[PDB]
Amino acid sequence: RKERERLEEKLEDANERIAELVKLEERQRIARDLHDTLGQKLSLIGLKSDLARKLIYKDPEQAARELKSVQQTARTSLNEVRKIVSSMKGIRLKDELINIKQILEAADIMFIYEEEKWPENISLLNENILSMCLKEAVTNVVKHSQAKTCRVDIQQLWKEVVITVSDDGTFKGEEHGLLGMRERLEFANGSLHIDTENGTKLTMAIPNN
Amino acid sequence: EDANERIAELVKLEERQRIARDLHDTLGQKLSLIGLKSDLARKLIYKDPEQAARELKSVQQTARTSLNEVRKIVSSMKGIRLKDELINIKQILEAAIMFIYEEEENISLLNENILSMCLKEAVTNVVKHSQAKRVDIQQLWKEVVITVSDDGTFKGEENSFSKGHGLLGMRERLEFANGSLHITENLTMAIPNNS
Ligand SMILES: Nc1ncnc2c1ncn2[C@@H]1O[C@H](COP(=O)(O)OP(=O)(O)CP(=O)(O)O)[C@@H](O)[C@H]1O
Ligand SMILES: Nc1ncnc2c1ncn2[C@@H]1O[C@H](COP(=O)(O)OP(=O)(O)CP(=O)(O)O)[C@@H](O)[C@H]1O
Ligand SMILES: [Mg+2]
Ligand SMILES: [Mg+2]
């Protein structure tokens, strides 16, 4: 009634705690990978730059040689990092749009999309969740529907980004990606609804603004 | 089970995106700076050596600090030293012997390092002497117990050697840590968890 509160909050608290443990586990895993790559390179840079400083007067040529070495190892280390950052990032929704056009065309399914109410600003996290859901919704159309047409709408409506994926095929079986998407969306305080009357239509919403 | 699995995967992902931004900014920037300054510094070796030296002291500082955090996160991590020794002994046994191990978390860095040293020596002895063709690491009550068994033949004489040898070395080091070493029919080493 009003204890429903005390409870929802103990729930909030435990979720947060579980949260920081998983979070930390990941942070450490990454810290080990970084030490394992960049570690020796950074130490080397330090050493050589120190040695080089020592040789400025004594052996200018040897110092320049050393600084060339420093330059190379800093360059390549910077690469390791660019790669990692890119890898750790996600898929932009505009890029996923292009992937699904290619996939639907390759499957001989008509793709209907017109940009309307494109989100003004969405968090990179929520954008990446939506990209993942959009990919799966279309994988399902291709694998199961036997559709000839697929309609995708991506709109900012009220305080949500709403994606609808509809097809004119037939829904297969009775009550995996559907639970996967719903769980991912619900974790983001979003929702997933499915209508299987005239083919299959997925409505996925996630908060924004 | 997945219910909790896949949610935790979502938290990791988020975390992963966050670290990604942080890296980009801090470390990516520090490496670019290092490159720049080291290049400028090279340019000044002859024309302005004093400047070149200052630049180089700076590069030194930014390289040293560059992984501080990472270094810290890994510095306070328990399980690693022994987890790395596990990898070394797999390599050594393969280069020599079938290795049988199945994962079975909390100790002290000191006691972990003592165990790594003993594990290395136990396996060096297997490789050098046994002519063998199994390692257990378990947290039992308030001890960490490591067993290293082999299917070769024991080569030791009536006496259990002395100074300059690993068996006495391991026993002495373990016993000083309030641990134990027992041993040849067909090594059990224990150390207290926190002390
Ligand atoms: N667009 C669509 N059209 C027709 N049937 C669909 C559909 N999307 C899903 N289905 C039906 O719902 C079922 C469950 O879908 P879901 O995505 O969860 O698993 P799946 O069969 O695609 C394997 P996975 O998702 O692990 O790749 C499918 O097996 C299919 O019968
Ligand atoms: N796993 C094993 N299998 C067979 N014999 C072993 C063995 N471990 C030890 N031994 C025997 O016990 C003896 C004493 O071992 P110990 O480790 O103390 O010295 P060592 O011969 O390895 C030189 P050091 O230990 O200084 O490197 C060995 O010389 C060998 O005969
Ligand atoms: Mg599916
Ligand atoms: Mg020995």
Author numbering:
A (entry chain A): 154 to 328, 335 to 368
B (entry chain B): 165 to 260, 262 to 269, 273 to 301, 304 to 353, 355 to 357, 361 to 369
Verbatim from the authors:
The simplest TCSs comprise a sensory histidine kinase (HK) and a response regulator (RR) component. To address this question we have used the TCS DesK-DesR from B. subtilis as a model. We had previously shown that the HK DesK, a member of the HisKA_3 family, undergoes important conformational changes to switch between phosphatase- and phosphotransfer-competent states. We now report the crystal structures of the DesKC:DesR complex, trapped in the phosphatase and the phosphotransferase functional states.
HK activation leads to autophosphorylation and subsequent switching to its phosphotransferase state. Upon auto-phosphorylation DesKC adopts a strongly asymmetric conformation able to transfer the phosphoryl group to DesR, its downstream RR partner. Comparing the conformation of the phosphorylatable histidine between HKs performing auto-phosphorylation, and the phosphotransferase complex (this study), the His residue shows ~180° flipping of its imidazole side chain. During auto-phosphorylation, HisNδ1 has been observed to H-bond with the ultra-conserved acidic His + 1 residue, which corresponds to Asp189(HK) in DesK. Once phosphorylated, the His disrupts its contact with this neighbor carboxylate group, stabilizing the P~HK species and leading to His χ−2 dihedral angle flipping. Subsequent re-protonation of His188Nδ1, triggered by RR binding, is consistent with P-N bond weakening, as a first step towards phosphotransfer.
